[PDB]
């Protein structure tokens with residue numbers, strides 16, 4: 749089983765106060781990430797082509813640029829697992845974090861896309877999660893969920909050995925438009941959202957309620 753807690757070791761940068769500085773420095777940071785992360789570079793190049801195709805269909809929040817769009821498209825792609833792991837295990841050995849720019853752009857994409865609306869979402873997993881009683885919960889990593897319980901419980905994401913999270917999120921963003929899917933009705937939740945009410949029901953249902961945005965352990969680390 750995996751532990752569900754406040755994600756004390758996750759890279760949870762919210763970039764409070766350094767957005768202008770990051771928008772200037774992240775392009776350089778991105779080249780650095782790529783130079784040491786071949787898988788990310790490939791996922792990004794492929795996502796940039798798809799973004800090019802998606803972009804004309806609609807308008808995006810002011811300040812939302814191609815980096816934000818390409819990061820989000822890439823995330824719904826195959827790179828999510830490796831990225832999330834790197835974020836989750838950050839504090840462990842923060843010398844080899846090669847998603848410095850990627851983490852910023854994806855974080856900023858969701859910040860720009862989130863109006864504040866709250867959602868009832870569901871997330872299915874094939875690995876059992878155990879709440880270790882910390883008092884509250886943060887996912888740490890960016891966390892995918894769906895507006896549809898059907899989707900969350902589908903064999904694609906869930907099995908009896910895993911967990912179904914029933915979540916009320918107010919920072920999650922409906923990113924259907926961006927996904928290589930998009931019938932997954934995905935709501936992407938930032939890892940720094942805190943759920944003040946945690947309730948386990950049965951062996952595989954975890955209810956996460958009372959979301960709140962709280963300060964992160966890291967802030968503008970690479971700015």
Ligand SMILES: NC(=O)c1csc([C@@H]2O[C@H](COP(=O)(O)CP(=O)(O)OC[C@H]3O[C@@H](n4cnc5c(N)ncnc54)[C@H](O)[C@@H]3O)[C@@H](O)[C@H]2O)n1
Pocket residue numbers: 750751823824825826828829832833836870871872873874875890891892893894899900901905932934
């Ligand atoms: N899960 C859903 O219901 C759902 C709805 S849309 C969606 C899509 O699924 C794809 C992958 O997303 P996902 O977030 O499941 C990938 P996520 O990084 O959760 O991968 C899950 C695996 O990573 C490891 N892991 C995850 N969390 C932890 C943890 N807290 N501690 C230790 N190890 C952990 C384990 O191997 C776990 O099985 C994306 O394309 C996303 O768009 N998933």
